[PDB]
Design a protein around this ligand. Structure first.
Ligand code: K
Ligand code: K
Ligand code: MG
Ligand code: MG
Lengths: 406, 418
C-alpha cells in the first residue's frame, strides 16, 4: 500500500528529534514556540519526555535517564529548562525527595563539551565595553563537582582517600584531614582521561572551525596532579595533532591559570574559544552571557564525543518572559538534525527563525526584560514591550513573511 | 637617659610589623616603597622574613611557616608577591622540591577571610558600566582546593573516600569512582565547621561595618552536603545574631547560587559584600578587579578569627618580564600601587591596635597621595593604556618605575608637611 498513497506532508520533513519538556514558565513558552513557530512548518518524528519536576517525581527520576538514552539513539535532544529541587521545592511541590540535577544526569550519560555563547542583538547594550566579538565557552560536561561524593563530618576523626588498583598492586591511602577540632565537610571527586581527551579535541576543533585562538583555564599550581592532567592532556594533543593547523590559521592555544583568564577575558575584545572545566564553565558562562547584555540570551549545545549526537538546551529558566533561548534551543537542534540528514530545507528553516528572532528585536519589538536592558526597568512602560503572546505572534508574522520569500 | 635627650625624632613610631619579602619585580618595588615612602617618615620594629624563592628553598620552606607564626604573635603582617613554582621554576633555580604556595601555607596557619576590593581612581575607566559603588569580596582563606589531596589514577581501579570517627563508632566508605576502562585524576578536599563559622562572622561584620547587603555564593543544589553546610551555617548565624541588626540598617543577607551570583554582580551597580568560598574568591576577585579598570589595583587583607591579626598582601605579582628588563638595566614602568596599599593597610591596622594617631594619619595620607597623583595625570604605563588603549601610548604619557616613585615621594612630602 505504500506505493499507492502519496501521503507526504506539505511541511518540511524534519526527522527524528528527542524533546525534554521542562518547568515553570519556560514549559509554557516551549509549547507556544512549538505551536506558532515550529509545527506549522515542520513535521517531526518527536519523541517526548516530560522532565518537568512533577513527572520526575512520578517516575523516580527514571524519565531523565530514558530521555538521555533516547538522545544516544536518535542523535538530537532539545531540552527545556528544568528545576533542580532544593529543600523548599520538595515541600512546595510535595515531592518524594531531592531529585539530583537532571542536566547532570543527562551530561554524565552522554558526555562531551557544552558550547555556550551570547545571542547578540545590535540594540541590547553590553555591560562589558570592549566585547566587540563573541566569546565561546566550551564547558567540559563530565565529572568534577557534578559526579562528586560529598558528606558531613559529624565530629573528630580521619577522612582518608584511597585507590585500590584493578590488579594486585596494593592500595594507596592518603590522609585528607584529621579532624580533632570538631566536624565539617569532605568530598571526593574525579575525572577520566578519555573524557578529558575528548574535551580537548572538541575545543581544538572549535577553535579551528571559527578561526580563533583557544585558552584552557585550570589552577594546576594548586591542583598539581588533578589540573596538571588537564593541562598535560591538552598540550600533548595540541602538539601532535593541532599545532600545524593552528599555525596555518594564524591562531594559538595557551594554558592560563583560572584567575588570570577571567581577568584576561574581561579585559579582552572577544573572539576566542575558552575551554573550561565543568564548574568554571558553569560559572563563567553566566558571567559572559550577562556581560553581553542578557543572561537569557545564550545558546548552549552539548556536543557529544561521538561527533554526531547533540543536546541543545535552554539553560536558564526564569531568572529572578524571554523566549529566545528556548527558540534557539529548537533552531540549534534542528540545524544539527538538518546536518545529519543533509536536509537543505530544515537548515534553511532553522537559520531563518534565528534571523527573524534577532531582526524582530532589532526592529524594536521585544519582551519586557529586553526593554529593561535598554532603558532600565524603572523607566519601562507597557507600550515599550510586547507580552509573551504578542511577541510570539509578531515572530510568527515575520517568520511566515520570510519563509514565503524563499 | 631619655629625659635628658631633649630632641624628638622626625619619624613616627610605627611599632611592631612582620614583613614577608617576595620575588622578582614586586620585590624591587617593595624595597623602593620602603626606601622612599615608609622609612623616611616612620620608624619600624620590622620582623623580616625572606619568602623569595631562593630562601624558601634554602630553608625547606620553613621560613614561610615561621613568618606565619610571627604574624600570629605580632598581629600585623605585610606580604610581597611571591612565586609559587611550577616545573620551569624547579629547573630554573634547581629547587629541591616544587614548593607549595606560600599564601596557601600562610592562610592555612592564620585562617580567616581575605577581603578584596578595587582601588578606584576617577580617571581610570571601568570595563563594567554599572559598577559605580565598590564590590568587596570576602574570600574564605582556608581549606577546599587549597588544602586538597589530589593524584593521578594510573589505570583501572577503585577510588573511595572514608571517614573513621575517633569515638570508635564506625567507618563510612563512599565510592568515588570505579575506573574501568582506563585512568584519570581524583581528589579529596575538606573544610571545617569552626572556620566556616568565622568566615560567616566576618562576612556579617563587614556588611554592618559598611552598611551594605551581604551575599554568600555556593552551588548547594549540586554539592548538597559540602556547600549546604556553608549555607546552613551562614543562615543560623544570621538568624541568631545579625538579622535584626541588618533589618535595623536597611540591609539583608541572601544565599545565591554561584552562577546566578556572578551574573547578578555583572548587572549590578556594586555596593555589596560578597562572601566567596576559597576558590570562588580567588577566581572572582580578579574578575572584579579587572572590571573596575585594572587587575593590579586591588587591596587584599586577610582578617583572622581573633579580630586582631591581619595580613595585608600585594596579591598580583612578581611581573617577570619587567624583572628581566630590570636585571639588564632596561627601564620598566611597573605599577607599585598594590604593594603600597599592602603597607598602608597593614599600617592602618597597626595604628588601630596601638591607638597611634600619627601612623593612622600617615597610612591614610599615603593612600590619598597615591590616588591624587594618578588622578592628577602621573601614572605608570599600564594605567595610561587603560585610558588611551596601549597602541596609542607614547613615552610622554607615563612615568618609568623610579620616576613614579619619586613623584609619589614629593607629593607625599608635601601632604605630610601641611
Ligand atoms: K596566579
Ligand atoms: K542554577
Ligand atoms: Mg549554569
Ligand atoms: Mg587570585
Amino acid at each position: 500500500n505504500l506505493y499507492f498513497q502519496s501521503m507526504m506532508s506539505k511541511k518540511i520533513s524534519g526527522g527524528s528529534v528527542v524533546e525534554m519538556q521542562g518547568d515553570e514558565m519556560t514549559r509554557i513558552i516551549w509549547e507556544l514556540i512549538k505551536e506558532k513557530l515550529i509545527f506549522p512548518y515542520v513535521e517531526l518524528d518527536l519523541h517526548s519526555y516530560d522532565l518537568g519536576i512533577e513527572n520526575r517525581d512520578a517516575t523516580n527520576d527514571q524519565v531523565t535517564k530514558d530521555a538521555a538514552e533516547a538522545i544516544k539513539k536518535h542523535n538530537v535532544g532539545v531540552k527545556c529548562a528544568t528545576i533542580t529541587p532544593d529543600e523548599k521545592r520538595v515541600e512546595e511541590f510535595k515531592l518524594k525527595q531531592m531529585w539530583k540535577s537532571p542536566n547532570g544526569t543527562i551530561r554524565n550519560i552522554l558526555g562531551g563539551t557544552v558550547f555556550r555563547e551570547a545571542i547578540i542583538c545590535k540594540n541590547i547594550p553590553r555591560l562589558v565595553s570592549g566585547w566587540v566579538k563573541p566569546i565561546i565557552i566550551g564547558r567540559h560536561a563530565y565529572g568534577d563537582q557534578y559526579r562528586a561524593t560529598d558528606f558531613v563530618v559529624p565530629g573528630p576523626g580521619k577522612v582518608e582517600i584511597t585507590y585500590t588498583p584493578s590488579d594486585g598492586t596494593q592500595k594507596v591511602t592518603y590522609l585528607v584531614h584529621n579532624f580533632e577540632e570538631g566536624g565539617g565537610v569532605a568530598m571526593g571527586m574525579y575525572n577520566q582521561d578519555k573524557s578529558i581527551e575528548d574535551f580537548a579535541h572538541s575545543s581544538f576543533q572549535m577553535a579551528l572551525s571559527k578561526g580563533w585562538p583557544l585558552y584552557l583555564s585550570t589552577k594546576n599550581t594548586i591542583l598539581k596532579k588533578y589540573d596538571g592532567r588537564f593541562k598535560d592532556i591538552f598540550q600533548e594533543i595540541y602538539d601532535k595533532q593541532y599545532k600545524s593547523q593552528f599555525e596555518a590559521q594564524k591562531i594559538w592555544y595557551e594554558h592560563r591559570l583560572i584567575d588570570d583568564m577571567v581577568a584576561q577575558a574581561m579585559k579582552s575584545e572577544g573572539g576566542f574559544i575558552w575551554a573550561c572545566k565543568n564548574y568554571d564553565g558553569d560559572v563563567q558562562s553566566d558571567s559572559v552571557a550577562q556581560g553581553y547584555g542578557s543572561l537569557g540570551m545564550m545558546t548552549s549545545v552539548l556536543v557529544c564525543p561521538d561527533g554526531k549526537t547533540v543536546e541543545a538546551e535552554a539553560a536558564h529558566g526564569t531568572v529572578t518572559t524571554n523566549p529566545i533561548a528556548s527558540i534557539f534551543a529548537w533552531t540549534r537542534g534542528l540545524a544539527h538534525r538538518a546536518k545529519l540528514d543533509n536536509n537543505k530545507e530544515l537548515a534553511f528553516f532553522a537559520n531563518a527563525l534565528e534571523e527573524v528572532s534577532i531582526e524582530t528585536i532589532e526592529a524594536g519589538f521585544m519582551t519586557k526584560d529586553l526593554a529593561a536592558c535598554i532603558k532600565g526597568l524603572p523607566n519601562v512602560q507597557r507600550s515599550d514591550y510586547l507580552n509573551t503572546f504578542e511577541f510570539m505572534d509578531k515572530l510568527g508574522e515575520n517568520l511566515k513573511i520570510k519563509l514565503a520569500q524563499a
